[PDB]
């Protein structure tokens, strides 16, 4: 089988929170005002597909969040995000591969070049076959072509495809081109999945 | 009862590991290279005591491990480390305070002007009475008189007073005082030592 994962609130606990609170820390801007500013919009998804600078991207945010900061500033509180890697599925992953299942990962993110980002933790390196990135690709979930591009350099067909997102218009993207799509709703969803599969 | 609370692997989980992760990404030096050359000596108690500015400090760790980093990407980094509430521990000290206990953070911290640190965060403002930070008092456990500060400041006796650290010397430093002090060996430690005072009542 192939196995793709998604990366955050999958294979890690991501929380921009803790960004919000960094620029509230340096900006002095109340954090309820960034909580009701911060939205996903074209700008994100631009990013995401690697058709902005990470300077144009900041721009973007900033301008939307009334954020007084350089560049440096931005991606100095960026780099806070909260990341707790979740043990049980980095497991999962591995032994998924020494069963000779093959295991990816597909993520769109919103590293910049000066953060240091989950999809480069060496844990996370270390527990895939592969890692695809929107930004790498021009290409972002739930667009059908990200999928089909896995499928394709991976080699196999959606029948015989598997993917755990805990986003449902991911899930949907996915369900589109026949691949099974599994709603990751919390830590239990790949653990009770796995179960049987590893047995 | 005063209750002393350290912040480090007590209040949240801290992994310094996430930052020379970040600076390992950032200058490719290979991470088994930081591990071995970053260590917790002079420049770090200095540091910690207010005595040495940021950029002293920074300075002072990238001559150790040969860091080719400005102020800002160290801090960048350093902004990196890992932080995860205990969300038991938090819980604890609030209903510690509605029950009319005085409850504070001690803490030996080498927060910069730049990074948000954990003292800062609103959940742990909002747990403690008062915050208590080696920067700002020119001191830092195990020195006596970080213990003997927060006795003083609070109207507190030694008898009086619970303190928890995961940090042995910490904890030595307020036995020498005859502080009641809890080793945190792991996160059960704080919530078993308030089960056991919860089932002394009748
Ligand atoms: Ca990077
Ligand atoms: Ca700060
Ligand atoms: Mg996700
Ligand atoms: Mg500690």
Redesign the pocket.
């Known amino acids: 089988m192939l196995y793709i994962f998604?990366?955050?609130?999958?294979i890690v606990d991501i929380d921009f929170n803790r960004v919000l609170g960094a620029w509230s820390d340096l900006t002095r801007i109340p954090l309820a005002s960034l909580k009701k500013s911060f939205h996903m919009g074209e700008a994100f998804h631009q990013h995401e597909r690697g058709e902005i600078s990470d300077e144009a991207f900041a721009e973007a945010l900033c301008h939307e969040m009334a954020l007084p900061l350089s560049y440096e500033q931005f991606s100095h509180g960026w780099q806070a995000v909260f990341v707790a890697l979740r043990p049980e599925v980095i497991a999962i992953m591995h032994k998924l591969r020494e069963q000779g299942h093959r295991v990816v990962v597909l993520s769109n993110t919103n590293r910049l070049h000066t953060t240091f980002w989950p999809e480069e933790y060496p844990e996370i390196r270390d527990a895939a076959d592969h890692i695809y990135l929107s930004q790498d690709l021009g290409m972002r979930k739930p667009e059908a072509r990200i999928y089909q591009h896995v499928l394709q350099a991976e080699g196999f067909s959606p029948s015989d495809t598997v993917f755990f997102?805990?986003?449902a218009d991911?899930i949907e993207g996915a369900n589109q081109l026949g691949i099974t799509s599994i709603l990751?709703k919390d830590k239990t969803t790949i653990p009770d999945y796995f179960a049987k599969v590893l047995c």
Not at 6 to 10: E, K
């Open positions: 998604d990366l955050g609130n999958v997102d805990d986003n991911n990751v």
